[PDB]
């Protein structure tokens, strides 16, 4: 369903766009936003989301702490999380894998790339 709810945490810029704008071309209109990990966790208690897209670098609470926290929450631990960054570091990619992320993408990227990503995650999660 194109009725799947996204939560776009962080700045969300992509180079010539924004995550929320690229989602609309793929057909995903049901999206809300958060500014950092703390804002994200508050909104997440309202319940009803099905996928999260987050920045690595954010103020107050970064992408990694956010991710270990969603994974420990017995209520949303099976929640899909795709990491977004503009600095590719082996050490950050390793850390995100063992912490339980569903993917990793390096900006700038286009609608093409986000589609291959989303699809691959839908398949390995079976949804």
Curated annotation (Swiss-Prot):
SUPFAM superfamilies: CheY-like
Superkingdom to which the source organism belongs: Bacteria
Domain Response regulatory: 5-122
Location(s) in or outside the cell: Cytoplasm
Example GO biological process: chemotaxis
Cofactor(s) in the UniProt record: Mg(2+)
Cofactor binding notes: Binds 1 Mg(2+) ion per subunit.
UniProt entry tagged with the keyword Ribonucleoprotein: no
Keywords on record: Acetylation, Chemotaxis, Cytoplasm, Flagellar rotation, Magnesium, Metal-binding, Phosphoprotein, Two-component regulatory system
GO molecular function annotation: metal ion binding
Membrane-spanning segments: none
PTM text: Phosphorylated by CheA or acetylated by acetyl-CoA synthetase, depending on which acetate metabolism pathway is available.
GO cellular component entries: cytoplasm
Modified residues annotated as 4-aspartylphosphate in this record: 55
Binding site for Mg(2+): 55, 57
Residues that bear N6-acetyllysine: 90, 107
Main location: cytoplasm
PANTHER family in the cross-refs: TWO-COMPONENT RESPONSE REGULATOR, TWO-COMPONENT RESPONSE REGULATOR ARR22
Function recorded in the entry: Involved in the transmission of sensory signals from the chemoreceptors to the flagellar motors. In its active (phosphorylated or acetylated) form, CheY exhibits enhanced binding to a switch component, FliM, at the flagellar motor which induces a change from counterclockwise to clockwise flagellar rotation.
Protein name: Chemotaxis protein CheY
Organism this protein belongs to: Shigella flexneri
């Amino acid at each position: 369903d194109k009725e799947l709810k996204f939560l776009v945490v962080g700045n969300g810029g992509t180079g010539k766009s924004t995550v929320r704008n690229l989602l609309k071309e793929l057909g995903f209109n049901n999206v809300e936003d958060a500014e950092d990990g703390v804002d994200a966790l508050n909104k997440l208690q309202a319940g009803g989301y099905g996928f999260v897209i987050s920045d690595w670098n954010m103020p107050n609470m970064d992408g990694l702490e956010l991710l270990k926290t969603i994974r420990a929450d017995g209520a949303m631990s099976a929640l899909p999380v795709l990491m977004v960054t503009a600095e590719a570091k082996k050490e950050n990619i390793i850390a995100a894998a063992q912490a339980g992320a569903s993917g990793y993408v390096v900006k700038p990227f286009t609608a093409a790339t986000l589609e291959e990503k989303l699809n691959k995650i839908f398949e390995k999660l079976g949804m």
